Assembly symmetry: C3
Homo-oligomer: 643 residues x 3
Amino acid sequence: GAASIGYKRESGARLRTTADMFKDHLNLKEYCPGDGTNQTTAFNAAIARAVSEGISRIIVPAGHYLVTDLSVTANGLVFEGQGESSRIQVASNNSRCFSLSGDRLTFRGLKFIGDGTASASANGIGILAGDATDLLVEDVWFDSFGFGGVNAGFTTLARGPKFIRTRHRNTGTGGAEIYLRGLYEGADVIDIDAATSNADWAVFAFDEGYAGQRDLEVTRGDFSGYKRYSIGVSDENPSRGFGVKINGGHHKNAGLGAVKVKNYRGVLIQGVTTDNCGIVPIAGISNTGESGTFYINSAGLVDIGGCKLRDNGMDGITVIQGAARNQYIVHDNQIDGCGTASYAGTGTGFRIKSGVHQAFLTNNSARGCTRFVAELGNDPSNISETITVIGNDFSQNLSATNGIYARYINRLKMDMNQIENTGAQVVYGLDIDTVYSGPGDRFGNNTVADFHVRFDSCRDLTLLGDYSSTDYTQWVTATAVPVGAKRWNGANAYVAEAAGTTGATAPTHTSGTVSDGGVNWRYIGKRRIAAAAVALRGTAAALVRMGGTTRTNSTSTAHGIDFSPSPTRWEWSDIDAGTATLAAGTVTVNITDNRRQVDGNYRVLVTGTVNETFYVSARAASNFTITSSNAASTATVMWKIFR
Amino acid sequence: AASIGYKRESGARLRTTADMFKDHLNLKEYCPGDGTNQTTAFNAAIARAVSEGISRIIVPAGHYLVTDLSVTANGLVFEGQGESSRIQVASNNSRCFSLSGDRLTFRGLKFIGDGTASASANGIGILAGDATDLLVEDVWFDSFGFGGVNAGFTTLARGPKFIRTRHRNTGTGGAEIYLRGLYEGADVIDIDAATSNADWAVFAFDEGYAGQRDLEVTRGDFSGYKRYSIGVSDENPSGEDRGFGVKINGGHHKNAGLGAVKVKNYRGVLIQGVTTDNCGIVPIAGISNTGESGTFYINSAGLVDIGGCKLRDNGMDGITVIQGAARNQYIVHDNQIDGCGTASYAGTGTGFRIKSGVHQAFLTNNSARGCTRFVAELGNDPSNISETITVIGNDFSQNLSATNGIYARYINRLKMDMNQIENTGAQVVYGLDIDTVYSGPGDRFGNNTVADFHVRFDSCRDLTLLGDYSSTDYTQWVTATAVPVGAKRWNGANAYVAEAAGTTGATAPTHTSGTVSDGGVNWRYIGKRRIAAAAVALRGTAAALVRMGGTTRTNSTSTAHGIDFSPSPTRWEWSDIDAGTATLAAGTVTVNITDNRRQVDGNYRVLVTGTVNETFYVSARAASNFTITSSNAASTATVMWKIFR
Amino acid sequence: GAASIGYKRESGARLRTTADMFKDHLNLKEYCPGDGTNQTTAFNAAIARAVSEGISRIIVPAGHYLVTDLSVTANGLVFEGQGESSRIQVASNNSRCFSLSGDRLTFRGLKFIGDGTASASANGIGILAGDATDLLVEDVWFDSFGFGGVNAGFTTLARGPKFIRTRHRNTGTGGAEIYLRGLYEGADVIDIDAATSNADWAVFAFDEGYAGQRDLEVTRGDFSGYKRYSIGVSDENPSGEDRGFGVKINGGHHKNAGLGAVKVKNYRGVLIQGVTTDNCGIVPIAGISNTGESGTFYINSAGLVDIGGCKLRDNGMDGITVIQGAARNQYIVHDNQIDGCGTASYAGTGTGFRIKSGVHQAFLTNNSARGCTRFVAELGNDPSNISETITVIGNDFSQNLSATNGIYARYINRLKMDMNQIENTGAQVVYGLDIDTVYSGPGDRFGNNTVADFHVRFDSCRDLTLLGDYSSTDYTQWVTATAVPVGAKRWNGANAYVAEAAGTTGATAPTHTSGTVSDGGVNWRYIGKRRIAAAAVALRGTAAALVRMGGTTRTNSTSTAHGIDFSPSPTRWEWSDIDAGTATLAAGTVTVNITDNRRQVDGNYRVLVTGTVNETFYVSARAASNFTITSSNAASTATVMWKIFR
């Protein structure tokens, strides 16, 4: 037949037959009809024929190949489908299409189809791999599998699989689209298209008892609607390599969150964006402290940056340590909404409980939190050592109860932070040995007649920041205001959303935007509602050190000081200074309004300009008197106020 | 051929040679590929593949002239074998394909147009309307009057994927990749885009359709586009649903007319690790002189995070982030500008432009060189007030051509620390109409280029200035002295740095630019020595509070004090100015204030207590000295004093 | 034969022959038997047939094609292998399989095999390229080549190659898997699989005398075992880099590298992000490692350096090294982590951060380092080239017990520091020498020595401002039968400990200087020494012109009560807000005690005081720990307010 029909492209070519042109390759339909019947025996023969002839690629043309648990133990084989019409279906309940042990296998251009049934994480699966190294899975569609697409496990260190542009649909309850087990290096998930209504995970990894290197790098996926996290990554026995890297992708509609990590040595999450994740809490999980669209638990190294997490139904970013030690950096992230699911004990922007790790919170911002914008430490069992806070913006969280909630910390460093119009207490610290809030810090503008900054049973406190209330300019009719200007009326404050001219309807609303007649005013918070700027409770502080940059002004009192258990030593440098001129041998000097004191126990220094003895005869909360030995004194004296 | 039997071995199926062919669909089974108009035959191949249930259509080497090939089915794979698999448009102002089918893919092809176009859906290789999961990979688009692919969407689905697409010779006003409507997961990976006439490489707009519009660009190559390489626009961003916006991850841009990236109203912008060179080099009248300037131009985005971007030889501005009139962070961090204003356009040449309005902005660990206008201008919109801009650890030094290092205006609160600006601007930092200014102890703004103020503030209410605003007191250039490389010496009005270690020659350096050799050492000009008229100056309406401390440096300018308050502040606090102990003689001492802390007047406060039973008082106070006298006209006591405001 | 057998899919299709269906493509086996014989003449005839027929793709089925120096000069060709059994082996020693000069060529799905021999960088190679622009090479395996897989050179600016998922094995002595020469734009190495025992580099690039743009981007490779650096990149004329940035490295994992993972010499731009390494720099080389060149990242004299998000574990020699000799853009090192250093015990070596910036303004932000010998971070330290500005923000260098210095700074003009955390590292936590201006903000914490030495020491520095916490931690004592939470810190003897678990104490005090040992009920981990420092702040060398401290400065709880050890005293010493309070006289005088933490080194400090009544008050005496206030009235019972400062 074909073996007797010679073929020659031109005279200079070899003399071959039309059969030779076909035999250079291996068409699957030389063995399989592709008519939707059970074809496992034919498929197995074609795999074995390629191995026997020394051929790698097996062309899978358009067809329907119903097939059960195919074993391939050879190495170089390429299963090259021509498109989504190259359909490979499971033929039985609770089974799979392929069982892989050969190395350097590659699947391409195929559509795998299941039957929606599964009796194990090793069934209801397109492909089960066991120590199949360097597995390449590219441009393949997994549809209607009871558990997922590929389950790859390893019992000895080797190259992990590469999933490039895999499509996953209709997976069903309790499933993982990609299931990695054991120890591996160089595993990659690139441009995944994951979307379900019932499956738990898109990418799941578990050690399965085996210890050692597990290098996974997920870049640029699309994850939709997974009931547990989109990417689940677990090591139960931490005890070479780095860990997991997540370089981007978009997540939405996830039930618990986008990323969960357990006990991995190193964690690198960069540029990930989520929306409406963690929107279905699970009783028995979400109320046990595990909450957050990022949930990183007991990792040796954590670096999450450039991540934009919007409308989180539960907590935002949660980084927790239990009981190797490396950095916890949370930098350049944004949280837009938190607690949209209205789950109790939930709605926190940043949950950083670092413990032995020295944490770094840098240049983050958060909006729309219902619990704490950032809670730091807060474990009576496991003390967090060092947490330093640089240049964060936790403003405009009117539904939060605390801007920063910090407890059970050894040293808390803060500077350049901006938190306005959030929380009953803007910053609330408890049981912290050493707190430092630099001059660049700004914590103020309450939502409730309470303390801007409160510290309970904290030993060493250095507070140099601006903890005042904003002394807003008042709202007036028929005055020119630019968009961004801030006026106050009654008990509230507002921002202009459009440059214009003031109407006659003075703003009175407590939420949203309302036109005053022409100008649109948006509510931002309350005006000077705080009961005090800096408050102390619990056991007495050993030291409270303030300076010339500390601002406690414009609250309900002139001083903004509320120490109910008084600190054993309260230092305050450069409170006030000036020059006065005596008359009839006396002056009573008025302290500037922003630095009026809580009592008259502050220290005063004074030296005169003439040969007279000057002394401080009285000290009040808002003034002090300087008298001279000359009852007719008219001299000038220079004075200084401090503690 | 249907009668010629074929069998691999005895255990295989008995098939014909025609059966082996019919498993696939060769396009040349219908199209001759000889350069003639073959739309009818091409359509029959497409229609045959759909009826046979075949996805892949193999497109061998050939020349296929084609016009408006409609495909509505979903499985099809148009698989060319390389660049000789040529598909040409066969009509003016038309296209090769019109797709509505989902999961389509094109591979290994070369599309050729005819340089003509009349609308964005003409002069196009492929038009797509609601064609979901479009993959377009390793295909070359050449000579298309408008562009390569136009993909639009009216309902939310998977956006297109363009992998290693090549674009050449497009044409005036064209866009290589047109994106319309709402979509998720759009990807442009490793694009090879270059023109002499086209306007954009990637252009995306809503066309009235609100919703999620997620586009990601990674590691492209963009050269020559007369507008921006990547332009992206939304008109109803409140309806952006469950999306984020635009992400740009790498790639190199060059020779762009206006810039590399333009964004308008997108809810989220992520630009990371992008490098440009010679971008913004062809200004356009009516655009470039209206405030739209900068090789990155981000206008009214809800969230902006650009980092690790290195922008070289910008013809206009560098990075511009502007707000009009949801409210999220503006982070510009770890970026670099090497040069600006190389086109010599008026009102143009600013390194950083951050007008953030309600957005809380962060400027952290950036650096800029070669700026001509401002190195960074913050706020500066009388209409729209910028709330908070905090500036940590930036390097704006060695911009000898800039008029200001930092020009800030119309901000409510400006927080700065750890910044380093030397040898830039007539005024290093110029603030106007700012309510609260904080400059931490790590801030260093000094070494003018003109006899002017290091740090000037106009009509600013609350000023806290704890940084080093001094002039560097360079040591003088000397002959026959060994200098290490990196050493700084002054001669005349100019300061210099050593390019090599060695021993100075005999001819003192007197140049105001470049590097000239003394007899044995090459000296590079770096700026002017102690030329400043003052370190800290105030103008406009009086400041309510000026607060300095023991770290504030105002020394070594033209004056000993470095203060120039033409409207004096209503309150001036300066703690820890000077202190010491003096021992009296004949009942008096006149103490000299330390050189670096000499004052502008004698209105500072003096405290002093004695060592013995005498009354001690301060009888005189001047700008540079003050006297302490005692009751005992023969006093020899030691007194401890302190100077402050 | 085949040309007379008609084929027709259906009535509506063209009537062709079975030969026409084959003549649409070009099967290589139409000219080559693939039987292991020398087939270069046949392979050349196959390539030439594709060119004259206008076909691009040449299908390479499973087979063994022995081949030598195949020249292809045409442009569109695609060499389309079918898998790893598509084997193209070199036929001669010291030779190559291909020599490319054509543009837009692509190789896909092949396995190239060498014979282990090489006599030059252009031999022992799978593919030599010369001005072969727009080269793509994807999913192809290079094995057993004497020098490497691809050597691509360029003499005029054009688009460099793209190596996508290329596998490299068994390259041998002194080779480089990928060799880029000359000037180019848009070169890419994506997802490389690189592993050898004998090769020097995975990716290497140098100018070869051609100045211009040399843009290279590496993304997400796998590198193991290379005797030099995994990625080596070099230029000798950098000023004329034309319209190009430099080299970008965006991830990948390196391991078992001889010298390091990345080397750069004189590139205008360097961008490294997200790279993780393990056990790199483990085979030092005499004549290199002991000449200053050390570090798994070694960036020498680059014009711009931004490295961030990199995690370097178990470095044999040095961590990140950034050096500049003698355009002038930023040096940013941020958000990086060193986990181990100096594991190879090589001399003069073990430093986590080596930053020699010179004219570049350097930034050290939010980095951490552990397990360092030598110095955790050494800044400047070049008697040649002064480092002009280095500013160090929010770094954590704590718990490097085996290091001699946390920070060793030298030959810097201006050193700015704040928000750093360095506890339990070094004989001196921070040691600065020959620095003109030093600033250490109130958020800095440098304390808890490992030697009876100085927490912070400065030699021959001119302007020093120290506002941070340089105290010894005053640990609470370990006591029997007291509940402790995990993370608590107690002391015993000369050592301090931290708890590994909550519970109640035992009855055997911790006496170990390493690791973890149970006391009976709780396991205590050794973390450092207790109050061992001789002084908090020390000054040597030429006298400082100014030492400025403030109310936030901490020098307490060391060996002495003051923490001061100025051997050449500074010409001016300002210390604001040392202490203050109110005293009440008795029999005319009081002697006020300075608080324990702020006890002074002498009685040369200043005192201010004013009284509450009409009496003349003065300070008749001042001692290191106390001063006396007396009045004119020898029966004074008056209250007086005072303040201590310098």
